[PDB]
Design an enzyme around this catalytic site. Structure first.
Site, PDB file in Angstrom:
ATOM      1  N   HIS A  29       2.067   6.640  -1.138  1.00 27.29           N
ATOM      2  CA  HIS A  29       2.402   6.671   0.279  1.00 27.29           C
ATOM      3  C   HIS A  29       2.811   8.081   0.698  1.00 27.29           C
ATOM      4  CE1 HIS A  29       4.530   5.964   4.044  1.00 27.29           C
ATOM      5  NE2 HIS A  29       5.674   6.325   3.454  1.00 27.29           N
ATOM      6  N   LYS A  40      -6.468  -1.223  -2.397  1.00 30.49           N
ATOM      7  CA  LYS A  40      -7.104  -0.203  -1.574  1.00 30.49           C
ATOM      8  C   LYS A  40      -8.162   0.532  -2.392  1.00 30.49           C
ATOM      9  CE  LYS A  40      -3.256   2.039  -0.530  1.00 30.49           C
ATOM     10  NZ  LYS A  40      -2.427   1.255  -1.474  1.00 30.49           N
ATOM     11  N   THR A  41      -7.802   0.897  -3.630  1.00 29.23           N
ATOM     12  CA  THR A  41      -8.669   1.670  -4.507  1.00 29.23           C
ATOM     13  C   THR A  41      -9.786   0.792  -5.073  1.00 29.23           C
ATOM     14  OG1 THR A  41      -8.745   3.445  -6.115  1.00 29.23           O
ATOM     15  CG2 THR A  41      -7.288   1.613  -6.664  1.00 29.23           C
ATOM     16  N   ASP A  85      -0.629  -1.503  -3.960  1.00 23.10           N
ATOM     17  CA  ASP A  85      -1.061  -2.702  -4.670  1.00 23.10           C
ATOM     18  C   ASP A  85      -1.582  -3.756  -3.690  1.00 23.10           C
ATOM     19  OD1 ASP A  85      -0.634  -1.381  -7.155  1.00 23.10           O
ATOM     20  OD2 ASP A  85       1.428  -2.144  -7.274  1.00 23.10           O
TER      21      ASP A  85
HETATM   22  N1  GDP Z   1      -6.903 -11.434  -7.489  1.00 21.72           N
HETATM   23  C1  GDP Z   1      -7.205 -10.219  -6.972  1.00 21.72           C
HETATM   24  N2  GDP Z   1      -6.515  -9.128  -7.413  1.00 21.72           N
HETATM   25  C2  GDP Z   1      -6.773  -7.878  -6.931  1.00 21.72           C
HETATM   26  C3  GDP Z   1      -7.828  -7.726  -5.910  1.00 21.72           C
HETATM   27  N3  GDP Z   1      -7.884  -6.417  -5.607  1.00 21.72           N
HETATM   28  C4  GDP Z   1      -6.952  -5.784  -6.364  1.00 21.72           C
HETATM   29  N4  GDP Z   1      -6.287  -6.648  -7.157  1.00 21.72           N
HETATM   30  C5  GDP Z   1      -5.196  -6.300  -8.114  1.00 21.72           C
HETATM   31  O1  GDP Z   1      -4.522  -5.092  -7.739  1.00 21.72           O
HETATM   32  C6  GDP Z   1      -4.207  -4.309  -8.896  1.00 21.72           C
HETATM   33  C7  GDP Z   1      -4.618  -2.860  -8.688  1.00 21.72           C
HETATM   34  O2  GDP Z   1      -4.013  -2.354  -7.505  1.00 21.72           O
HETATM   35  P1  GDP Z   1      -4.553  -0.985  -6.856  1.00 21.72           P
HETATM   36  O3  GDP Z   1      -5.838  -1.303  -6.134  1.00 21.72           O
HETATM   37  O4  GDP Z   1      -4.514   0.103  -7.903  1.00 21.72           O
HETATM   38  O5  GDP Z   1      -3.394  -0.664  -5.787  1.00 21.72           O
HETATM   39  P2  GDP Z   1      -3.554   0.394  -4.582  1.00 21.72           P
HETATM   40  O6  GDP Z   1      -4.468   1.476  -5.099  1.00 21.72           O
HETATM   41  O7  GDP Z   1      -2.143   0.864  -4.332  1.00 21.72           O
HETATM   42  O8  GDP Z   1      -4.123  -0.430  -3.454  1.00 21.72           O
HETATM   43  C8  GDP Z   1      -4.964  -4.899 -10.076  1.00 21.72           C
HETATM   44  O9  GDP Z   1      -4.036  -5.281 -11.098  1.00 21.72           O
HETATM   45  C9  GDP Z   1      -5.744  -6.083  -9.520  1.00 21.72           C
HETATM   46  O10 GDP Z   1      -5.594  -7.267 -10.319  1.00 21.72           O
HETATM   47  C10 GDP Z   1      -8.535  -8.964  -5.478  1.00 21.72           C
HETATM   48  O11 GDP Z   1      -9.438  -8.921  -4.620  1.00 21.72           O
HETATM   49  N5  GDP Z   1      -8.180 -10.133  -6.040  1.00 21.72           N
HETATM   50 MG    MG Z   2      -5.078   3.325  -3.395  1.00 23.96          MG
END
Ligand code: GDP
Ligand code: MG
Ligand code: PNS
Ligand code: MG
Lengths: 133, 381, 87, 68, 115, 217
Positions: B76, B16-17, B13
């Site tokens: 992870h 990254k994606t 979170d």
């Molecule tokens: N405010 C804001 N929220 C973000 C940003 N990038 C991601 N998010 C939040 O991160 C959440 C998704 O996380 P995700 O990318 O799936 O996590 P990861 O894949 O583990 O990195 C969403 O609910 C977005 O609101 C950003 O640049 N700004």
């Molecule tokens: Mg990811």
């Protein structure tokens, strides 16, 4: 799911790492309606054969396609001979003892021309159907 | 168009994606390469090899400067498996940190294993910035110093991943991704390829012809084979000095060998009895067998099919590397009592006999016909 | 690549391969003794010996002449046809 | 045999195929072909020599099955 | 259908099966819930003053359409293990033997002809 | 003209529509796979897909001995002695499994069934697995083999000597005795030749089938 498929090259290399004593992999033509590839591998001991057979089947399931049917090992009760049938591959796990007596490679490479078929002769009933001593 | 592999890395979170979706999205505007939907990237395709199931998402984006390949992982536990096994090796990496979280001891492991994958060039990106942002930035430089990077020259870029994806902030979201695009084109954009290293051949088969001598076959990964080369075979406490006579490819004689090819090494004045599988073909004085080895091994979770009961020290699994098989003994590092499934940590595992183990030598730990761990060598002791 | 085909060097490499063979040992092996009778080798055994010569020099041996090659001295003379040595 | 040449030709030709082997253990293939040509031979009648040669000839062809 | 007290023909290269004897081999027992045995079923044999297990391979009674129908009751002598005592099967065996449930792979391995 | 036996329906209380339905289905299948004109004496080689394998192709050659059934389920049975074993297979004509049917040797025998060939000497049912097709000019009378076959000893699968079988293709003189012949005659039923309501004329029926068939093509 996606990646390596089930074929000879992967299957043989998979065998070899468990110290497969001898490997004979035989291409079977379509006229012989059994399989694409016949495989014979030897083993050291009875429990060594189970090791190999059980690894091969286990690894199979890992790389197996969803719709690809499940397979059954044969002859777990048997001492010397174990067999596993796949879709288009058939494998025979044996001692060197049973290899000396079955000669599976000879049968499948040359069908009607093997020595074992030559000794045995077809028996015919006599004409007029009379036996004499 | 030079092509290299670069992969995102960081805490969950941290967006990254979203960045992965964003970097392909901006290029879609120019029409550089095929772009995937964010939700499509969320669902990672399954990859199965060596009894290890992995959800790896692969997106291909071609920048104007150079061609790139990108990797993403949902978890992870998924991240560690990819890099330890090195299914798709990555030349570069992008470290992504949230504005609200920044560095975290969980993210440490990510950079700690990055030492072992032979990558020493990293890119830092900050997202979720919608002066506190600049406050977290200085620790990142310090954090990279701890692992062994020099923190100063590392590029740190302010932006928002969501802003870039939605294209709502051209001065923030857009400017960030182009800066990231430029940063990667600055740090290790050109691939590293050389064959200066001495050749290693794990012997696949031992093949003897009377009036020819033993032929041993193996796949190249390092070095080049030449005829008349004085060579060493070592393994299972058997070390003999000999000479290469002939090299075989497509049942033909060739002077020069290449990496990723299965070559047949012809040797003379030796017995087949001594020469078996498990032997390794190198130049003398180059490498030596290491009995005790430090390595970071990922212990498989119960979910995949790993064992339910966690193990204690003096556990005896089965070690698989190259063409050789041997069992070993795992001593657990102090402060730890047991090693639970799904958790990766460094060990000092000791082989029964001295056997060759070098840096970046991938291995899997086993128990009979079951896989419990996969690991990579960190140090030879 | 051109290797110097010294008659003496030809002899050395010919006897080198014969000592490599399992059936025949260097004790009874000589330059002048023939395979079939003196070294006590079967006709099938011979076939393998000629194969050793086949790949070493890299010139094809037809099956018609392979039969008459039953002596090391015959061989060192036969391969002298490949590159003429006088000395 | 039918021809003394033909049998030595067959023994030659079979071993040449052995080099081209990919999956089959090459040491075993050679060992298996050697012992066959040993124990069978040196002791046969004229008529059965026509049959045993043919058995080898179909092995050469590998029409009915080829070992790889 | 091969039931109790049926004469069978041993289609093997096994010594026991091909040996000259005053009795034809007889079906002692059928290993099925109902006594009738079709192809692939195991049956017990009284040959030459001993009991031996055997696999039914083709029979005279009509079967499913495209399946072959033989003119003699053919059995292969097997050990309790599942290992066939003989080495070769001269006579053709039906291909159907493959998909049927049980240990058939070994017998297929030693057979030459499929019909 | 030749109409396949299957098309002509048996006497029944089946509504005509049921036959029309089945005929349309048969005719569709005939377009896909050519069904050759064969008779009971004729030699056929049939190529089929083998479901017990991964789509490998099986061919079997033998002499036809009977042809029976109506509609889609219509069948024929092929006989042959393979390397010292008699084998019989019943084949469906409209089974999708069958790949190709070829007429290797088109001939009639004296009688319409040949199930007695089981009791005949082995060689009369032994046919070479690899034999070359022998073909005749299109506007030639369908050739008849007037072979009568020698028999095994008298314990037979059925009592062929009895007149209900009406077998014309057996050398009875060789096996039977005169007294056995006159014993068999006790089952004669001479009125049955002249039973008028017993007969089944298919003239108008076949005509209507022809009308349907010519419409199909
Ligand atoms: N405010 C804001 N929220 C973000 C940003 N990038 C991601 N998010 C939040 O991160 C959440 C998704 O996380 P995700 O990318 O799936 O996590 P990861 O894949 O583990 O990195 C969403 O609910 C977005 O609101 C950003 O640049 N700004
Ligand atoms: Mg990811
Ligand atoms: P070589 O001089 O040892 O003998 C040649 C031969 C063994 C191949 C053969 O010609 C022979 O002397 N014996 C004939 C018996 C035989 O089995 N013939 C070969 C048929 S495969
Ligand atoms: Mg009856």
């Amino acid at each position: 799911h996606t990646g390596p498929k089930f074929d000879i090259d992967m299957m043989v290399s998979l065998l070899r790492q468990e110290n497969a004593r001898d490997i004979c992999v035989i291409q079977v033509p379509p006229e012989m309606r059994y399989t694409d590839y016949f495989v014979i591998v030897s083993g050291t001991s009875t429990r060594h054969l189970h090791a190999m057979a059980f690894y091969v089947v286990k690894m199979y399931k890992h790389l197996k396609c969803k719709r690809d049917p499940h397979v059954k090992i044969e002859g777990k009760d048997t001492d010397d001979w174990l067999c596993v049938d796949f879709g288009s591959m058939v494998i025979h796990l044996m001692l060197p003892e049973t290899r000396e007596i079955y000669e599976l490679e000879k049968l499948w490479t040359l069908r009607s021309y093997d020595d074992q078929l030559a000794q045995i002769a077809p028996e015919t009933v006599p004409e007029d159907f009379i036996l004499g001593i | 168009k030079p092509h290299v592999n670069v992969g995102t890395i960081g805490h969950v979170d941290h967006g990254k994606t979203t960045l992965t979706a964003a970097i392909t999205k901006i290029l879609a505007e120019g029409g550089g390469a095929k772009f995937k939907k964010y939700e499509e990237i969320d669902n990672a395709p399954e990859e199965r090899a060596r009894g290890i199931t992995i959800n790896a998402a692969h997106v291909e984006y071609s920048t104007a400067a150079r061609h790139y390949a990108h990797t993403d992982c949902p978890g992870h536990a998924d991240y560690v498996k990819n890099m330890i096994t090195g299914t798709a090796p990555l030349d570069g990496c992008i470290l992504v940190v949230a504005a609200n979280d920044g560095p975290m001891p969980q993210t440490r492991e990510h950079l700690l294993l990055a030492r072992q994958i032979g990558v020493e060039h990293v890119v830092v990106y900050v997202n979720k910035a919608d002066e506190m942002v600049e406050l977290v930035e200085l620790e990142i430089r310090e954090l990279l110093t701890e692992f062994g990077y020099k923190g100063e020259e590392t590029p740190v870029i302010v932006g928002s991943a969501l802003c870039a994806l939605e294209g709502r902030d051209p001065e923030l979201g857009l400017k960030s991704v182009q800066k990231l695009l430029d940063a990667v084109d600055t740090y290790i954009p050109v691939p590293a390829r050389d064959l200066e290293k001495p050749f290693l051949l794990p012997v696949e088969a031992v093949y003897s012809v009377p009036g020819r001598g033993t032929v041993v076959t193996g796949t190249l990964e390092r070095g080049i084979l030449k005829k008349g080369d004085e060579c060493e075979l070592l393994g299972h406490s058997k070390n003999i000095r000999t000479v290469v006579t002939g090299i075989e490819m497509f049942h033909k004689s060739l002077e020069r060998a290449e990496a990723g090819d299965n070559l047949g090494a012809l040797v003379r004045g030796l017995k087949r009895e001594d020469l078996r599988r498990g032997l390794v073909m190198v130049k003398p004085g180059s490498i030596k067998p290491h009995q005790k080895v430090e390595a970071q091994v990922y212990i498989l979770s119960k979910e995949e099919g790993g064992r339910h009961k966690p193990f204690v020290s003096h556990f005896m699994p089965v070690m698989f590397s190259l063409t050789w098989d041997m069992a070993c003994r795992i001593i657990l590092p102090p402060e730890k009592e047991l090693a639970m499934p799904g958790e990766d940590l460094k060990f000092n595992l000791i082989l029964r006999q001295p056997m060759i183990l070098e840096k970046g030598q991938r291995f899997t730990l086993r128990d009979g016909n079951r896989t419990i761990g996969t690991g990579l060598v960190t140090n030879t002791l | 690549d051109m290797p110097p085909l010294t008659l003496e060097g030809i002899q050395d490499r010919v006897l080198y391969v014969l000592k490599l063979y399992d059936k025949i040992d260097p004790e009874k092996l000589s330059v002048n003794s023939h395979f079939m009778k003196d070294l006590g080798l079967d006709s099938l055994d011979q076939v393998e010996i000629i194969m050793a010569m086949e790949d070493e020099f890299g010139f094809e041996i037809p099956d018609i002449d392979a039969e008459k090659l039953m002596c090391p001295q015959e061989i060192v003379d036969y391969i002298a046809d490949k590159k003429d040595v006088y000395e | 045999p039918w021809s003394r040449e033909a049998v030595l030709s067959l023994y030659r030709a079979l071993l040449r195929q052995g080099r081209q082997l990919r999956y089959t253990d090459r040491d075993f293939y050679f060992a298996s072909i050697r012992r066959e040509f040993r124990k069978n031979q040196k002791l046969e009648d004229a008529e059965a020599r026509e049959r045993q040669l043919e058995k080898g000839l179909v092995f050469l062809n590998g029409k009915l099955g080829r070992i790889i | 259908a091969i039931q109790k007290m049926t004469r069978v023909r041993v289609v093997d290269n096994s010594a026991l099966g091909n040996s000259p004897y005053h009795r034809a081999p007889r079906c002692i027992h059928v290993y099925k819930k109902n006594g009738v045995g079709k192809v692939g079923d195991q049956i017990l044999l009284a040959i030459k003053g001993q009991k031996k297990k055997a696999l039914i391979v083709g029979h005279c009674m009509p079967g499913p359409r495209m399946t072959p129908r033989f003119d003699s009751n053919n059995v292969v002598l097997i050990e309790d293990n599942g290992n066939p005592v003989g080495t070769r099967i001269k006579t053709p065996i039906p291909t159907s033997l493959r998909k049927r449930e049980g240990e058939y792979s070994k017998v297929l391995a030693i057979a030459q002809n499929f019909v | 003209r030749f109409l396949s036996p299957e098309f002509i329906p048996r006497r029944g209380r089946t509504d005509p529509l049921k036959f029309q339905i089945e005929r349309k289905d048969m005719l569709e299948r005939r377009k896909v796979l050519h069904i050759p004109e064969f008779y009971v004496g004729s030699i056929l080689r049939v190529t089929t897909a083998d479901p017990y394998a991964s789509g490998k192709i099986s061919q079997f050659l033998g002499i036809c001995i009977q042809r029976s059934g109506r509609g889609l389920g219509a069948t024929f049975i092929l006989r042959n002695v393979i390397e010292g074993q008699g084998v019989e297979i019943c084949f469906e004509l409209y089974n999708p499994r069958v790949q190709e049917i070829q007429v290797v040797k088109l001939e009639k025998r004296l009688d319409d069934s040949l199930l007695y060939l089981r009791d005949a000497l082995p060689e009369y049912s032994t046919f070479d697995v690899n034999m070359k097709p022998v073909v005749q000019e299109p506007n030639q009378k369908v050739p008849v083999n007037e072979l009568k076959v020698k028999m095994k000893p008298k314990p037979w699968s059925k009592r062929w000597e009895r007149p209900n079988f009406n077998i014309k293709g057996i050398r009875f003189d060789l096996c039977l005795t005169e007294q056995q012949m006159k014993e068999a005659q006790k089952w004669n039923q001479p009125w049955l030749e002249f039973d008028m309501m017993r007969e089944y004329d298919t003239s108008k029926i076949e005509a209507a089938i022809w009308k349907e068939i010519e419409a199909s093509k």
